[PDB]
Ligand binder design. Structure first.
Ligand code: NA
Length: 102
């Protein structure tokens, strides 16, 4: 359902969310972090899946790539959650970001 195949550049890294194998929306780590925090507020740190850590230096390809897997797993985990998957803040976030992909 949710997947993260490719990435991008320029200065920052972006993540191409594919819904059912087609492009869906493009987002950066800070945006997902923002999202995760809107969720932790309102639902509590319990219940929420684990979110990939901040970094203090720019990202090695291996890192970018690893952070890709972990954001991938995270989005799926939230979408699968009865409580989270149907949340307003999650779904509105999806809508806005999709509408954002030019
Ligand atoms: Na960022």
């Amino acid at each position: 359902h949710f997947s993260i195949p490719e990435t991008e550049s320029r200065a920052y890294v972006a993540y191409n969310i594919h819904v059912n194998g087609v492009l869906h929306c493009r987002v950066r780590y800070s945006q997902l972090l923002g999202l995760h925090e809107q969720l932790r507020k309102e639902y509590g740190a319990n219940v929420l899946p684990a979110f990939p850590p901040k970094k203090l230096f720019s990202l090695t390809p291996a890192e970018v790539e690893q952070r890709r897997e972990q954001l991938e797993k995270y989005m799926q985990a939230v979408r699968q959650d009865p409580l989270l998957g149907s949340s307003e803040t999650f779904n509105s976030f999806l809508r806005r970001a999709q509408q954002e992909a030019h």
